[PDB]
């Protein structure tokens, strides 16, 4: 009877969208490195 | 741009390491007074605040204030290939790669291509906990040890004379109390009675870099994230916020 949540419920909208953005940034870099 | 230098590769790499066992990607924002590095895990459940302060390093030249963006498992990756006092430099040109060297014995250098990302925001918006327990490493890491036995929540309770760490299964029971009569109990300030919980696993994984003597400070409210800082390796400051369990 204790149901998960995340800091969305509890942090500003803006800096969520932050992290978001750089996940998504982040999944897109996965290959290809110099020396 | 910017350049920085620190004696002891895998050192760094060590507190890079613990700092980021939760994450995939950070932000890492360089000032004048040292680099804060920022970042969740994917579902949101933990935001991490790592402080590196231009002391710990030989060289630290920073002209503007500049924040990049790193996959983290790219970063450990060529962390991992440092000995152990090597000297490690970042470079950082105009381009959107960081330079990662390490000198001694073999010089071998790296281009780590960064996240476009703008300028990260430092601070972490007074959130209104209710209590503050300062304790032990020693008893924090035993009682999520003993919990995980047993459940994959854990319940926090600070009332005005003591702190418990409480949580059932379908197995048992266990809980830690402390009072301020214990030495593992340094702190213990409670503006009003507050419970919350928080998942095992998470914990597990923020306490590990912590050592049994140093003081931790946990701060948390009424089914709300816990906050939880200490001071890792005799470097900085790691920081951690962590959504409850709830209902």
């Known amino acids: 009877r204790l149901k998960p949540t995340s800091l969305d419920s509890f942090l500003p909208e803006e800096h969520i969208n932050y992290f978001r953005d750089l996940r998504i940034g982040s999944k897109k870099i996965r290959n290809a490195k110099i020396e | ?247």
């Open chain 2, 1 to 247: 741009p910017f350049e920085v230098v620190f004696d002891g590769a895998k050192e760094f790499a060590d507190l890079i390491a613990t700092a980021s066992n939760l994450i995939d990607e950070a932000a890492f924002k360089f000032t004048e007074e040292g680099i804060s590095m920022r970042a969740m895990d994917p579902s949101r459940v933990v935001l991490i605040d790592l402080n590196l302060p231009e002391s710990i390093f030989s060289k630290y030249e920073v002209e503007e204030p500049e924040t990049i963006g790193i996959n983290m498992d790219q970063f450990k990756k060529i962390l991992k290939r440092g000995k152990a006092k090597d000297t490690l430099i970042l470079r950082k040109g105009d381009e959107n790669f960081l330079e990662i060297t390490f000198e001694g014995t073999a010089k071998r250098t790296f281009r780590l291509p960064l996240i476009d990302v703008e300028e990260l925001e430092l601070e972490l918006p007074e959130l209104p906990f209710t209590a503050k327990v300062v304790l032990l490493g020693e008893v924090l890491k035993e009682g999520i040890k003993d919990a995980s036995l047993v459940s994959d929540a854990i319940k926090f309770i600070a009332k005005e004379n003591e702190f418990t760490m409480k949580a059932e299964g379908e197995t048992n029971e266990v809980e830690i109390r402390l009072t301020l009569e214990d030495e593992g109990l340094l702190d213990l300030e409670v503006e009003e009675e507050t419970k919350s919980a928080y998942g095992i696993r998470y914990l597990s994984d923020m306490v590990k870099g912590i050592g049994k003597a140093d003081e931790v400070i946990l701060r948390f409210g009424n089914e709300m994230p816990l906050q939880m800082e200490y001071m890792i390796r005799d470097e900085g400051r790691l920081t951690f916020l962590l959504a409850p369990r709830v209902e």
